[PDB]
């Protein structure tokens, strides 16, 4: 009997968060998923589930759970949803059209922005084609934007594919950093490893 609580603290309150292009996965398994800690939060900017009601999370069993987390701008959080397009959905982190899981975000201006600007968080600006759902690209190959081949040297129509967010505490809300957690729920032909308390 799985009896130890799923370590949601280690996900939501991780001391470090990934750049979106290099998004972090934690596997959650062989644990009781108590969501009441998340239910009692007022500061999340969004908390939506797809394929299950948020009201039923404490009653459901899954074969596998993944927690994907990263930082993006406020007005890019709408892209972390099935059927979205934009730099983030297309080139950084793509959810499937039939996604089963929840997307939670919160403003992290107090932690992730600095007086000089925080340039540590990166996003992929260019890619030859869109990510498949749950695909991850950490390559730093020079992007050929034009006719001429680039020979892995930067210049005219030959761009380094990653760009920095540069988060300043004085940015408008849409340009402030937001932390995101995506909980993926799998229901495969396998034993359940994650259940709610009930």
């Amino acid at each position, epitope marked *: 009997n799985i009896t130890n609580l799923c370590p949601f603290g280690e996900v939501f309150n991780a001391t470090r968060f990934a750049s979106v292009y290099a998004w972090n996965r934690k596997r959650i398994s062989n644990c009781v998923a108590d969501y009441s800690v998340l239910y009692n939060s007022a500061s999340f*900017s969004t*908390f939506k589930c797809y394929g299950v009601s948020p009201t039923k999370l404490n009653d459901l069993c899954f074969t596998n759970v993944y927690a994907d987390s990263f930082v993006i701008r406020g007005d890019e959080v709408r892209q972390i*949803a099935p059927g979205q397009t934009g730099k983030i959905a297309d080139y950084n982190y793509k959810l499937p059209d039939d996604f089963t899981g929840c997307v939670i975000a919160w403003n992290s201006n107090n932690l992730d922005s600095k007086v000089g600007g925080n340039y540590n968080y990166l996003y992929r600006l260019f890619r030859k084609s869109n990510l498949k759902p749950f695909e991850r690209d950490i390559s730093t190959e020079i992007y050929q934007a034009g006719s001429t081949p680039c020979n892995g040297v930067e210049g005219f129509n030959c761009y380094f594919p990653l760009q920095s967010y540069g988060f300043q505490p004085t940015n408008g809300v849409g340009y402030q950093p937001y932390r995101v957690v995506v909980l993926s729920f799998e229901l495969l032909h396998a034993p359940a490893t994650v259940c709610g308390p009930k």
Partner: nanobody
Amino acid sequence: QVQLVESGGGLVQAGGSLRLACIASGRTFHSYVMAWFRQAPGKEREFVAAISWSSTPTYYGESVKGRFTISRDNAKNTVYLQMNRLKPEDTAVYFCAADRGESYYYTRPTEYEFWGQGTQVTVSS
């Protein structure tokens, strides 16, 4: 892009009934949580009701609980709001809304991507 058009609004006497309807574009209506909000003059958009994909969690604002019923007909891309025992305080613009996601914070306007232009309901006393 999903478009939404409300109908069935207008003038009605206190204690009367109205069925608002809202029809959506698109071939994946079943994938949308559908909702009703309303806005009285001087007030912000107030949550009225929402219905999940299966119909099976429904949600209601405190002041309409018992009087209003939300329902959906996936075959017709339509969500309905049955409004019974209407009071003057129910007078407002009623907005249809839709989102792929069901929100823990289901009363927040920002949790719904798609909005109709709204239709006036007026309840005389």
